Amino acid sequence: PQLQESGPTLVEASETLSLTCAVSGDSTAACNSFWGWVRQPPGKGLEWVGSLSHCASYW
Amino acid sequence: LTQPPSASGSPGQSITISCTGTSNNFVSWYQQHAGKAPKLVIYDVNKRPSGVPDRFSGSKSGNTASLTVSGLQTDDEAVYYCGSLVGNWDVIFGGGTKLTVLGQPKAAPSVTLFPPSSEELQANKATLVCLISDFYPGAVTVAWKADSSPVKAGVETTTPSKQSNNKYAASSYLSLTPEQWKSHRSYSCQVTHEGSTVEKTVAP
Amino acid sequence: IRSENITNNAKNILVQFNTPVQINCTRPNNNTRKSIRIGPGQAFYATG
Numbered sequence: 001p002q003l004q005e006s007g008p009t010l011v012e013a014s015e016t017l018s019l020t021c022a023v024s025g026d027s028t029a030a031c032n033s034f035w036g037w038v039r040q041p042p043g044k045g046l047e048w049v050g051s052l053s054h055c056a057s058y059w
Numbered sequence: 060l061t062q063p064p065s066a067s068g069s070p071g072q073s074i075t076i077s078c079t080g081t082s083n084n085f086v087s088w089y090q091q092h093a094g095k096a097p098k099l100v101i102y103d104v105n106k107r108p109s110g111v112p113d114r115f116s117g118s119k120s121g122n123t124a125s126l127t128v129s130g131l132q133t134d135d136e137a138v139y140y141c142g143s144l145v146g147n148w149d150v151i152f153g154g155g156t157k158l159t160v161l162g163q164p165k166a167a168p169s170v171t172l173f174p175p176s177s178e179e180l181q182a183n184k185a186t187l188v189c190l191i192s193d194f195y196p197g198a199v200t201v202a203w204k205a206d207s208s209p210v211k212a213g214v215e216t217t218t219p220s221k222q223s224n225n226k227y228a229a230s231s232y233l234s235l236t237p238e239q240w241k242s243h244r245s246y247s248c249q250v251t252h253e254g255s256t257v258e259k260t261v262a263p
Numbered sequence: 264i265r266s267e268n269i270t271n272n273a274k275n276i277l278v279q280f281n282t283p284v285q286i287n288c289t290r291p292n293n294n295t296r297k298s299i300r301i302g303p304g305q306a307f308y309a310t311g
Protein backbone atom coordinates (compact mmCIF):
# COMPACT_ATOMS: atom_id res chain seq x y z
CA PRO A 1 0.00 0.00 0.00
CA GLN A 2 1.49 3.30 -1.17
CA LEU A 3 0.06 6.82 -1.35
CA GLN A 4 1.50 9.19 -3.94
CA GLU A 5 0.58 12.89 -3.84
CA SER A 6 0.64 14.97 -7.02
CA GLY A 7 -0.15 18.54 -8.06
CA PRO A 8 1.19 22.12 -8.18
CA THR A 9 3.85 22.90 -5.57
CA LEU A 10 3.50 26.62 -6.28
CA VAL A 11 0.09 28.30 -6.42
CA GLU A 12 -0.86 31.98 -6.51
CA ALA A 13 -3.08 33.58 -3.85
CA SER A 14 -6.89 33.66 -4.13
CA GLU A 15 -6.68 30.97 -6.83
CA THR A 16 -7.88 27.37 -6.74
CA LEU A 17 -5.55 24.76 -5.25
CA SER A 18 -6.03 21.30 -6.76
CA LEU A 19 -4.34 18.09 -5.62
CA THR A 20 -4.74 14.45 -6.67
CA CYS A 21 -3.72 11.30 -4.78
CA ALA A 22 -2.85 8.09 -6.62
CA VAL A 23 -3.35 4.92 -4.58
CA SER A 24 -1.42 1.72 -5.27
CA GLY A 25 -2.10 -1.71 -3.78
CA ASP A 26 -5.65 -0.96 -2.68
CA SER A 27 -9.09 -0.12 -4.07
CA THR A 28 -10.98 3.09 -3.35
CA ALA A 29 -14.12 0.97 -3.60
CA ALA A 30 -13.19 -0.79 -0.35
CA CYS A 31 -15.60 0.07 2.47
CA ASN A 32 -13.03 -0.69 5.17
CA SER A 33 -11.55 2.82 5.32
CA PHE A 34 -12.22 6.46 4.45
CA TRP A 35 -10.09 8.47 2.04
CA GLY A 36 -9.11 12.10 2.55
CA TRP A 37 -6.33 14.55 3.37
CA VAL A 38 -4.34 15.87 6.33
CA ARG A 39 -2.19 18.97 5.90
CA GLN A 40 0.75 19.94 8.10
CA PRO A 41 1.86 23.60 7.90
CA PRO A 42 5.65 24.15 8.23
CA GLY A 43 6.82 23.63 11.82
CA LYS A 44 3.25 23.21 13.04
CA GLY A 45 0.74 20.59 14.19
CA LEU A 46 -1.48 18.14 12.30
CA GLU A 47 -4.86 19.45 11.12
CA TRP A 48 -7.77 17.36 9.80
CA VAL A 49 -9.15 18.38 6.40
CA GLY A 50 -11.87 15.90 5.45
CA SER A 51 -12.79 12.49 4.04
CA LEU A 52 -15.52 10.77 2.04
CA SER A 53 -16.80 7.36 0.95
CA HIS A 54 -19.12 6.10 -1.78
CA CYS A 55 -20.05 3.06 0.31
CA ALA A 56 -23.48 4.31 1.30
CA SER A 57 -26.73 3.40 3.01
CA TYR A 58 -30.39 3.46 2.01
CA TRP A 59 -30.87 7.22 2.41
CA LEU B 60 -6.38 18.07 22.83
CA THR B 61 -3.65 19.24 25.21
CA GLN B 62 -0.24 17.64 24.63
CA PRO B 63 2.89 18.63 26.61
CA PRO B 64 5.31 20.71 24.49
CA SER B 65 8.44 18.68 25.22
CA ALA B 66 9.71 15.42 26.72
CA SER B 67 13.17 14.02 27.40
CA GLY B 68 14.74 10.78 28.60
CA SER B 69 17.91 8.71 28.61
CA PRO B 70 18.24 5.45 26.63
CA GLY B 71 16.60 2.56 28.46
CA GLN B 72 14.41 4.80 30.60
CA SER B 73 10.62 4.88 30.24
CA ILE B 74 8.68 7.99 29.18
CA THR B 75 4.94 8.51 29.62
CA ILE B 76 3.35 11.34 27.64
CA SER B 77 -0.25 12.37 28.30
CA CYS B 78 -3.19 13.86 26.41
CA THR B 79 -6.45 15.38 27.66
CA GLY B 80 -9.84 16.26 26.20
CA THR B 81 -10.70 12.71 25.19
CA SER B 82 -14.10 11.61 26.46
CA ASN B 83 -14.11 8.67 24.06
CA ASN B 84 -11.84 5.69 23.44
CA PHE B 85 -10.93 6.66 19.87
CA VAL B 86 -7.61 8.10 21.08
CA SER B 87 -4.60 7.43 18.85
CA TRP B 88 -0.95 8.53 18.85
CA TYR B 89 1.37 9.29 15.92
CA GLN B 90 5.12 9.53 15.37
CA GLN B 91 6.61 12.01 12.90
CA HIS B 92 10.33 12.15 12.18
CA ALA B 93 11.63 15.58 11.15
CA GLY B 94 11.60 15.86 7.36
CA LYS B 95 9.43 12.76 7.07
CA ALA B 96 5.81 11.62 7.14
CA PRO B 97 3.90 10.85 10.37
CA LYS B 98 3.39 7.21 11.35
CA LEU B 99 0.67 5.78 13.59
CA VAL B 100 2.31 4.05 16.56
CA ILE B 101 -0.90 3.23 18.41
CA TYR B 102 -4.68 3.17 17.92
CA ASP B 103 -7.86 2.56 19.92
CA VAL B 104 -5.88 3.49 23.04
CA ASN B 105 -3.58 0.57 24.07
CA LYS B 106 -3.83 -1.50 20.86
CA ARG B 107 -0.69 -1.77 18.73
CA PRO B 108 -0.35 -1.97 14.92
CA SER B 109 1.88 -4.17 12.74
CA GLY B 110 5.66 -3.89 13.08
CA VAL B 111 5.42 -1.81 16.24
CA PRO B 112 7.49 -2.78 19.34
CA ASP B 113 5.73 -3.84 22.54
CA ARG B 114 7.33 -0.95 24.43
CA PHE B 115 4.72 1.42 22.99
CA SER B 116 1.52 1.36 25.06
CA GLY B 117 -1.56 3.59 25.04
CA SER B 118 -3.63 4.34 28.14
CA LYS B 119 -6.65 6.48 29.02
CA SER B 120 -7.81 7.38 32.53
CA GLY B 121 -10.87 9.58 32.94
CA ASN B 122 -10.54 12.56 30.62
CA THR B 123 -6.79 11.98 30.36
CA ALA B 124 -5.14 9.77 27.73
CA SER B 125 -1.53 8.60 28.04
CA LEU B 126 1.14 7.00 25.85
CA THR B 127 4.10 5.13 27.36
CA VAL B 128 7.48 4.49 25.72
CA SER B 129 9.90 2.23 27.61
CA GLY B 130 13.48 1.44 26.62
CA LEU B 131 14.31 4.66 24.79
CA GLN B 132 16.56 4.62 21.73
CA THR B 133 17.93 6.95 19.03
CA ASP B 134 15.04 6.25 16.64
CA ASP B 135 12.50 7.36 19.27
CA GLU B 136 13.53 10.99 18.76
CA ALA B 137 10.61 12.68 17.00
CA VAL B 138 7.37 14.60 17.47
CA TYR B 139 4.46 12.64 18.94
CA TYR B 140 0.88 13.72 18.19
CA CYS B 141 -2.33 12.39 19.74
CA GLY B 142 -5.78 12.36 18.15
CA SER B 143 -9.30 11.11 18.79
CA LEU B 144 -12.80 11.16 17.35
CA VAL B 145 -15.18 13.75 18.77
CA GLY B 146 -18.93 14.10 18.48
CA ASN B 147 -20.37 12.68 15.29
CA TRP B 148 -17.53 12.20 12.80
CA ASP B 149 -15.06 15.05 13.23
CA VAL B 150 -11.57 14.29 14.49
CA ILE B 151 -9.00 16.56 16.14
CA PHE B 152 -5.29 16.44 16.90
CA GLY B 153 -3.27 17.69 19.85
CA GLY B 154 -0.35 20.10 19.71
CA GLY B 155 1.90 17.06 19.85
CA THR B 156 4.71 16.09 22.20
CA LYS B 157 8.33 16.38 21.11
CA LEU B 158 10.41 13.56 22.54
CA THR B 159 14.17 13.73 22.13
CA VAL B 160 16.71 10.97 22.77
CA LEU B 161 19.68 13.19 21.91
CA GLY B 162 23.01 12.95 23.73
CA GLN B 163 24.05 14.67 26.96
CA PRO B 164 24.48 17.20 28.72
CA LYS B 165 21.78 19.61 29.94
CA ALA B 166 22.52 23.35 29.72
CA ALA B 167 21.02 26.80 30.32
CA PRO B 168 20.11 28.90 27.25
CA SER B 169 21.97 32.00 26.04
CA VAL B 170 20.23 35.22 25.00
CA THR B 171 21.59 38.06 22.86
CA LEU B 172 19.19 40.92 22.11
CA PHE B 173 19.74 43.36 19.23
CA PRO B 174 17.83 46.68 18.94
CA PRO B 175 16.82 48.00 15.48
CA SER B 176 19.53 49.58 13.33
CA SER B 177 19.79 53.13 12.01
CA GLU B 178 19.32 52.02 8.41
CA GLU B 179 16.24 49.96 9.33
CA LEU B 180 14.41 52.89 10.93
CA GLN B 181 14.79 54.66 7.59
CA ALA B 182 12.52 52.08 5.99
CA ASN B 183 9.98 53.13 8.62
CA LYS B 184 10.41 49.69 10.17
CA ALA B 185 11.59 48.50 13.58
CA THR B 186 12.53 44.90 14.40
CA LEU B 187 14.13 43.36 17.48
CA VAL B 188 15.57 39.83 17.42
CA CYS B 189 16.21 37.60 20.43
CA LEU B 190 18.81 34.90 19.77
CA ILE B 191 18.52 31.92 22.11
CA SER B 192 20.95 29.01 21.88
CA ASP B 193 22.81 26.21 23.69
CA PHE B 194 19.89 24.89 25.74
CA TYR B 195 18.45 21.52 26.77
CA PRO B 196 15.77 20.37 26.20
CA GLY B 197 15.04 21.79 22.75
CA ALA B 198 11.81 23.55 23.69
CA VAL B 199 11.84 27.13 25.00
CA THR B 200 9.19 29.84 25.31
CA VAL B 201 9.99 33.51 24.68
CA ALA B 202 8.19 36.59 26.05
CA TRP B 203 8.39 40.31 25.27
CA LYS B 204 7.93 43.43 27.42
CA ALA B 205 8.08 47.21 26.99
CA ASP B 206 9.38 49.11 30.04
CA SER B 207 7.07 47.10 32.30
CA SER B 208 3.87 45.92 30.62
CA PRO B 209 4.25 42.88 28.31
CA VAL B 210 4.05 43.14 24.52
CA LYS B 211 1.44 40.91 22.89
CA ALA B 212 1.74 42.24 19.34
CA GLY B 213 4.26 41.52 16.57
CA VAL B 214 5.65 38.32 18.07
CA GLU B 215 7.00 35.70 15.65
CA THR B 216 8.60 32.63 17.25
CA THR B 217 9.86 29.54 15.42
CA THR B 218 10.67 25.96 16.45
CA PRO B 219 14.29 25.47 17.66
CA SER B 220 16.79 23.38 15.69
CA LYS B 221 19.80 21.30 16.75
CA GLN B 222 23.27 22.73 16.08
CA SER B 223 26.64 21.19 15.26
CA ASN B 224 27.45 20.97 18.98
CA ASN B 225 24.12 19.14 19.50
CA LYS B 226 22.76 22.12 21.43
CA TYR B 227 19.41 23.55 20.31
CA ALA B 228 18.92 27.15 19.13
CA ALA B 229 15.98 29.44 18.33
CA SER B 230 15.22 33.04 17.32
CA SER B 231 12.17 35.24 17.98
CA TYR B 232 11.32 38.20 15.73
CA LEU B 233 9.46 41.29 16.98
CA SER B 234 8.26 43.73 14.31
CA LEU B 235 6.72 47.06 15.34
CA THR B 236 6.42 50.71 14.35
CA PRO B 237 9.28 53.19 14.92
CA GLU B 238 6.84 55.41 16.85
CA GLN B 239 6.33 52.96 19.72
CA TRP B 240 10.04 52.13 19.63
CA LYS B 241 11.26 55.67 20.35
CA SER B 242 8.42 56.35 22.80
CA HIS B 243 9.11 53.32 24.98
CA ARG B 244 12.70 53.53 26.22
CA SER B 245 13.58 49.95 27.09
CA TYR B 246 12.27 46.74 25.53
CA SER B 247 12.61 43.55 27.55
CA CYS B 248 12.80 40.03 26.14
CA GLN B 249 11.99 37.17 28.52
CA VAL B 250 13.15 33.65 27.71
CA THR B 251 11.71 30.83 29.83
CA HIS B 252 13.71 27.60 30.06
CA GLU B 253 12.53 24.77 32.34
CA GLY B 254 10.96 27.15 34.85
CA SER B 255 13.95 29.48 35.10
CA THR B 256 13.90 32.54 32.84
CA VAL B 257 16.61 34.59 31.12
CA GLU B 258 16.00 38.27 30.33
CA LYS B 259 17.64 40.91 28.13
CA THR B 260 16.88 44.61 27.62
CA VAL B 261 17.84 47.28 25.08
CA ALA B 262 17.29 51.05 24.87
CA PRO B 263 18.27 53.66 22.25
CA ILE C 264 -65.82 -4.49 6.87
CA ARG C 265 -66.14 -8.11 5.76
CA SER C 266 -66.58 -11.31 7.76
CA GLU C 267 -67.88 -14.79 6.95
CA ASN C 268 -69.69 -15.11 10.27
CA ILE C 269 -69.47 -11.92 12.31
CA THR C 270 -70.95 -12.84 15.69
CA ASN C 271 -68.76 -15.93 15.40
CA ASN C 272 -65.34 -15.23 16.89
CA ALA C 273 -63.86 -18.25 15.11
CA LYS C 274 -64.15 -16.51 11.74
CA ASN C 275 -61.59 -13.98 10.53
CA ILE C 276 -62.65 -10.41 9.76
CA LEU C 277 -61.50 -8.85 6.47
CA VAL C 278 -61.14 -5.06 6.34
CA GLN C 279 -60.81 -2.86 3.24
CA PHE C 280 -59.11 0.53 3.55
CA ASN C 281 -60.07 3.80 1.89
CA THR C 282 -56.71 5.59 1.89
CA PRO C 283 -53.47 3.58 1.42
CA VAL C 284 -51.03 3.42 4.34
CA GLN C 285 -47.36 4.22 3.71
CA ILE C 286 -45.13 1.41 4.94
CA ASN C 287 -41.36 1.06 4.75
CA CYS C 288 -39.53 -2.20 5.10
CA THR C 289 -35.79 -2.24 4.59
CA ARG C 290 -32.84 -4.53 5.10
CA PRO C 291 -30.36 -2.32 6.99
CA ASN C 292 -27.60 -4.82 6.27
CA ASN C 293 -25.44 -4.19 3.23
CA ASN C 294 -24.44 -7.64 2.04
CA THR C 295 -22.36 -9.51 -0.53
CA ARG C 296 -22.78 -12.80 -2.42
CA LYS C 297 -20.17 -15.54 -2.08
CA SER C 298 -21.31 -17.58 -5.10
CA ILE C 299 -19.46 -20.66 -3.83
CA ARG C 300 -18.85 -23.56 -6.22
CA ILE C 301 -20.37 -26.95 -5.41
CA GLY C 302 -19.91 -28.33 -8.91
CA PRO C 303 -19.75 -29.66 -11.45
CA GLY C 304 -21.85 -26.85 -12.91
CA GLN C 305 -23.66 -25.82 -9.73
CA ALA C 306 -22.97 -22.67 -7.72
CA PHE C 307 -24.52 -21.79 -4.35
CA TYR C 308 -24.94 -18.21 -3.13
CA ALA C 309 -23.81 -17.89 0.49
CA THR C 310 -24.39 -14.87 2.71
CA GLY C 311 -21.11 -13.02 3.22
Ligand SMILES: *[C@@H]1O[C@H](CO)[C@@H](O[C@@H]2O[C@H](CO)[C@@H](O[C@@H]3O[C@H](CO[C@H]4O[C@H](CO)[C@@H](O)[C@H](O[C@H]5O[C@H](CO)[C@@H](O)[C@H](O)[C@@H]5O)[C@@H]4O)[C@@H](O)[C@H](O[C@H]4O[C@H](CO)[C@@H](O)[C@H](O)[C@@H]4O[C@H]4O[C@H](CO)[C@@H](O)[C@H](O)[C@@H]4O[C@H]4O[C@H](CO)[C@@H](O)[C@H](O)[C@@H]4O)[C@@H]3O)[C@H](O)[C@H]2NC(C)=O)[C@H](O)[C@H]1NC(C)=O
Pocket residue numbers: 029030031054055056057058293294295
Ligand atom coordinates in the same frame (compact mmCIF):
# COMPACT_ATOMS: atom_id res chain seq x y z
C1 LIG D 1 -23.00 -1.32 0.12
O1 LIG D 1 -21.72 -1.88 0.04
C2 LIG D 1 -21.24 -1.97 -1.30
C3 LIG D 1 -19.89 -2.66 -1.23
O2 LIG D 1 -20.02 -4.00 -0.76
C4 LIG D 1 -21.16 -0.59 -1.95
O3 LIG D 1 -20.94 -0.81 -3.34
C5 LIG D 1 -19.98 0.11 -3.87
O4 LIG D 1 -20.59 1.34 -4.27
C6 LIG D 1 -19.69 2.29 -4.86
C7 LIG D 1 -20.51 3.53 -5.15
O5 LIG D 1 -21.41 3.32 -6.23
C8 LIG D 1 -19.07 1.68 -6.12
O6 LIG D 1 -18.17 2.60 -6.73
C9 LIG D 1 -18.64 2.74 -8.09
O7 LIG D 1 -17.73 2.15 -9.00
C10 LIG D 1 -18.22 2.20 -10.34
C11 LIG D 1 -17.42 1.21 -11.17
O8 LIG D 1 -17.64 -0.06 -10.56
C12 LIG D 1 -16.97 -1.11 -11.29
O9 LIG D 1 -15.59 -1.10 -11.02
C13 LIG D 1 -15.22 -1.29 -9.64
C14 LIG D 1 -13.72 -1.19 -9.55
O10 LIG D 1 -13.16 -2.34 -10.18
C15 LIG D 1 -15.76 -2.64 -9.15
O11 LIG D 1 -15.47 -2.79 -7.77
C16 LIG D 1 -17.28 -2.73 -9.38
O12 LIG D 1 -17.77 -4.00 -8.96
C17 LIG D 1 -19.00 -3.81 -8.23
O13 LIG D 1 -20.11 -3.98 -9.09
C18 LIG D 1 -20.24 -5.28 -9.68
C19 LIG D 1 -21.41 -5.24 -10.64
O14 LIG D 1 -21.14 -4.24 -11.62
C20 LIG D 1 -20.42 -6.31 -8.56
O15 LIG D 1 -20.53 -7.61 -9.12
C21 LIG D 1 -19.22 -6.25 -7.60
O16 LIG D 1 -19.39 -7.20 -6.55
C22 LIG D 1 -19.02 -4.83 -7.06
O17 LIG D 1 -20.11 -4.59 -6.18
C23 LIG D 1 -17.62 -2.44 -10.85
O18 LIG D 1 -17.11 -3.55 -11.59
C24 LIG D 1 -18.14 3.66 -10.79
O19 LIG D 1 -18.53 3.77 -12.14
C25 LIG D 1 -19.07 4.51 -9.89
O20 LIG D 1 -18.93 5.90 -10.17
C26 LIG D 1 -20.22 6.48 -10.48
O21 LIG D 1 -21.22 6.20 -9.47
C27 LIG D 1 -21.11 6.89 -8.19
C28 LIG D 1 -22.31 6.47 -7.35
O22 LIG D 1 -22.40 5.05 -7.38
C29 LIG D 1 -21.03 8.40 -8.41
O23 LIG D 1 -20.86 9.04 -7.15
C30 LIG D 1 -19.85 8.71 -9.32
O24 LIG D 1 -19.70 10.12 -9.46
C31 LIG D 1 -20.01 8.02 -10.67
O25 LIG D 1 -21.17 8.60 -11.27
C32 LIG D 1 -20.78 9.26 -12.50
O26 LIG D 1 -20.22 8.34 -13.44
C33 LIG D 1 -21.12 7.33 -13.98
C34 LIG D 1 -20.33 6.52 -15.00
O27 LIG D 1 -19.07 6.19 -14.42
C35 LIG D 1 -22.36 7.99 -14.60
O28 LIG D 1 -23.27 6.99 -15.02
C36 LIG D 1 -23.03 8.90 -13.55
O29 LIG D 1 -24.21 9.49 -14.09
C37 LIG D 1 -22.05 9.95 -13.06
O30 LIG D 1 -21.71 10.73 -14.21
C38 LIG D 1 -22.07 12.12 -14.00
O31 LIG D 1 -21.36 12.68 -12.90
C39 LIG D 1 -19.92 12.82 -13.05
C40 LIG D 1 -19.40 13.47 -11.78
O32 LIG D 1 -19.83 12.70 -10.67
C41 LIG D 1 -19.60 13.63 -14.31
O33 LIG D 1 -18.19 13.68 -14.49
C42 LIG D 1 -20.26 12.97 -15.53
O34 LIG D 1 -19.93 13.68 -16.71
C43 LIG D 1 -21.76 12.86 -15.33
O35 LIG D 1 -22.24 14.21 -15.29
C44 LIG D 1 -18.84 4.25 -8.39
O36 LIG D 1 -17.71 5.02 -8.00
C45 LIG D 1 -18.35 0.39 -5.76
O37 LIG D 1 -17.83 -0.22 -6.93
C46 LIG D 1 -19.34 -0.56 -5.09
N1 LIG D 1 -18.69 -1.82 -4.74
C47 LIG D 1 -17.70 -1.95 -3.86
C48 LIG D 1 -17.18 -3.34 -3.65
O38 LIG D 1 -17.23 -0.98 -3.25
C49 LIG D 1 -22.45 0.21 -1.78
O39 LIG D 1 -22.24 1.57 -2.13
C50 LIG D 1 -22.95 0.13 -0.34
N2 LIG D 1 -24.24 0.79 -0.20
C51 LIG D 1 -25.35 0.43 -0.85
C52 LIG D 1 -26.57 1.25 -0.56
O40 LIG D 1 -25.38 -0.52 -1.63
Ligand SMILES: *[C@@H]1O[C@H](CO)[C@@H](O[C@@H]2O[C@H](CO)[C@@H](O[C@@H]3O[C@H](CO[C@H]4O[C@H](CO[C@H]5O[C@H](CO)[C@@H](O)[C@H](O)[C@@H]5O)[C@@H](O)[C@H](O[C@H]5O[C@H](CO)[C@@H](O)[C@H](O)[C@@H]5O)[C@@H]4O)[C@@H](O)[C@H](O[C@H]4O[C@H](CO)[C@@H](O)[C@H](O)[C@@H]4O[C@H]4O[C@H](CO)[C@@H](O)[C@H](O)[C@@H]4O)[C@@H]3O)[C@H](O)[C@H]2NC(C)=O)[C@H](O)[C@H]1NC(C)=O
Pocket residue numbers: 268269270271272
Ligand atom coordinates in the same frame (compact mmCIF):
# COMPACT_ATOMS: atom_id res chain seq x y z
C1 LIG E 1 -72.93 -17.99 12.53
O1 LIG E 1 -72.55 -17.55 13.80
C2 LIG E 1 -73.67 -17.38 14.68
C3 LIG E 1 -73.15 -16.72 15.93
O2 LIG E 1 -71.82 -16.26 15.74
C4 LIG E 1 -74.31 -18.74 14.94
O3 LIG E 1 -75.47 -18.48 15.71
C5 LIG E 1 -75.71 -19.55 16.62
O4 LIG E 1 -76.72 -20.36 16.07
C6 LIG E 1 -77.04 -21.50 16.87
C7 LIG E 1 -77.98 -22.34 16.05
O5 LIG E 1 -77.34 -23.50 15.53
C8 LIG E 1 -77.62 -21.02 18.20
O6 LIG E 1 -77.88 -22.13 19.05
C9 LIG E 1 -79.30 -22.37 19.11
O7 LIG E 1 -79.97 -21.48 19.99
C10 LIG E 1 -81.39 -21.68 19.98
C11 LIG E 1 -82.02 -20.55 20.76
O8 LIG E 1 -81.48 -20.56 22.07
C12 LIG E 1 -81.81 -19.32 22.73
O9 LIG E 1 -83.15 -19.09 23.07
C13 LIG E 1 -83.80 -20.16 23.78
C14 LIG E 1 -85.25 -19.74 23.98
O10 LIG E 1 -85.35 -18.31 24.09
C15 LIG E 1 -86.72 -17.86 24.29
O11 LIG E 1 -87.33 -18.38 25.50
C16 LIG E 1 -86.95 -17.79 26.77
C17 LIG E 1 -87.84 -18.41 27.83
O12 LIG E 1 -89.16 -17.90 27.66
C18 LIG E 1 -87.10 -16.27 26.71
O13 LIG E 1 -86.69 -15.72 27.95
C19 LIG E 1 -86.22 -15.73 25.59
O14 LIG E 1 -86.24 -14.31 25.59
C20 LIG E 1 -86.68 -16.30 24.25
O15 LIG E 1 -87.97 -15.74 24.01
C21 LIG E 1 -83.03 -20.49 25.09
O16 LIG E 1 -83.53 -21.71 25.63
C22 LIG E 1 -81.50 -20.62 24.85
O17 LIG E 1 -80.83 -20.68 26.10
C23 LIG E 1 -80.13 -21.94 26.23
O18 LIG E 1 -79.07 -22.04 25.30
C24 LIG E 1 -78.00 -21.07 25.46
C25 LIG E 1 -76.99 -21.30 24.34
O19 LIG E 1 -76.33 -22.54 24.59
C26 LIG E 1 -77.39 -21.22 26.86
O20 LIG E 1 -76.38 -20.23 27.03
C27 LIG E 1 -78.48 -21.05 27.92
O21 LIG E 1 -77.93 -21.18 29.22
C28 LIG E 1 -79.63 -22.04 27.69
O22 LIG E 1 -79.09 -23.33 27.97
C29 LIG E 1 -80.96 -19.48 23.99
O23 LIG E 1 -81.03 -18.31 24.81
C30 LIG E 1 -81.67 -23.07 20.59
O24 LIG E 1 -83.06 -23.32 20.58
C31 LIG E 1 -80.93 -24.15 19.77
O25 LIG E 1 -81.07 -25.41 20.40
C32 LIG E 1 -81.23 -26.40 19.37
O26 LIG E 1 -79.97 -26.91 18.93
C33 LIG E 1 -79.21 -27.60 19.93
C34 LIG E 1 -77.86 -27.93 19.33
O27 LIG E 1 -77.04 -26.77 19.42
C35 LIG E 1 -80.00 -28.84 20.35
O28 LIG E 1 -79.26 -29.56 21.32
C36 LIG E 1 -81.36 -28.42 20.93
O29 LIG E 1 -82.12 -29.57 21.29
C37 LIG E 1 -82.14 -27.49 19.98
O30 LIG E 1 -82.71 -28.32 18.97
C38 LIG E 1 -84.14 -28.17 19.08
O31 LIG E 1 -84.65 -27.28 18.08
C39 LIG E 1 -84.51 -27.73 16.71
C40 LIG E 1 -85.09 -26.65 15.81
O32 LIG E 1 -86.45 -26.44 16.18
C41 LIG E 1 -85.22 -29.07 16.54
O33 LIG E 1 -85.05 -29.53 15.21
C42 LIG E 1 -84.62 -30.09 17.52
O34 LIG E 1 -85.21 -31.37 17.33
C43 LIG E 1 -84.75 -29.59 18.97
O35 LIG E 1 -86.14 -29.56 19.27
C44 LIG E 1 -79.46 -23.83 19.57
O36 LIG E 1 -78.81 -24.03 20.82
C45 LIG E 1 -76.63 -20.09 18.89
O37 LIG E 1 -77.23 -19.53 20.05
C46 LIG E 1 -76.18 -18.97 17.96
N1 LIG E 1 -75.12 -18.19 18.57
C47 LIG E 1 -75.34 -17.24 19.48
C48 LIG E 1 -74.12 -16.54 20.01
O38 LIG E 1 -76.47 -16.96 19.87
C49 LIG E 1 -74.68 -19.42 13.63
O39 LIG E 1 -75.05 -20.77 13.87
C50 LIG E 1 -73.52 -19.40 12.63
N2 LIG E 1 -73.97 -19.87 11.32
C51 LIG E 1 -73.15 -20.22 10.33
C52 LIG E 1 -73.81 -20.68 9.07
O40 LIG E 1 -71.93 -20.15 10.44
